[PDB]
Amino acid sequence: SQVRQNYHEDCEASINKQINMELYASYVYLSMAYYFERDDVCLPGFAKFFKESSDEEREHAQTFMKYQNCRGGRIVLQQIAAPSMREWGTGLEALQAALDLEKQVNQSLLELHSTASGNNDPCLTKLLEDEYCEEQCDSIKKIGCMITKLKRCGPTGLGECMFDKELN
């Protein structure tokens, strides 16, 4: 490829798995979002929050797809796994699953940060610092704080309603 320069083969394949990981995480958040719009659940604040996180994750994937093209590597998209669950239980259990999801996505980010370093691609490591750090710490903290807040407000009943309203 005419633009390819100092782009290791294994950085190329790791970028493709991060793309799949973000598309998957976007799919989970989509599952959670419409689970909370069910008639027997009906937590619209939760639903909006997970709709947006699913748009966010789909945007992160496209960011890694654009970086792939811009390095002259070639995107390899695979199947996107079905979400592990269909019914996410309570609002609290959804958030705990989402925190796990976010940590799973960001562990995978670190694994790609070491592959970028152990191949001397200074500018893929530059980009990953602007994902895995730049805003990852703000996002992991945000779900952590939501969990702390929901456990305080009382994780069921009226405390779950009040938490929903201040999400929305």
Site for Fe ion in 13-52 (CB under 5 A): none
Question: Pick from 34, 52, 59, 89: which binds a copy of itself (CB under 8 A)?
Answer: 34
Taking CB under 8 A as the rule, does residue 65 contact a copy of itself? yes
Closest CA relative to residue 9, chosen from 124, 106, 108: 124
Nearer to Fe ion, 119 or 139 (CB): 139
* Residue 130 known to bind ligand: yes
Taking CB under 5 A as the rule, does residue 139 contact Fe ion? yes
* Residue 79 known to bind ligand: no
Pull the structure tokens for residue 131: 């994902």
Pull the structure tokens for residue 18: 């991060």
70-99: which residues touch a copy of itself (CB under 8 A)?
70-72, 74-83, 86, 99
In 10 A of CB 40, how many CB atoms? 4
Question: Pick from 13, 52, 59, 66: which binds a copy of itself (CB under 8 A)?
Answer: 66
H-helix or E-strand spanning residue 101? helix 91-117
What is the spatial distance between Cα 19 and Cα 80, in angstroms, rounded to a whole number?
10
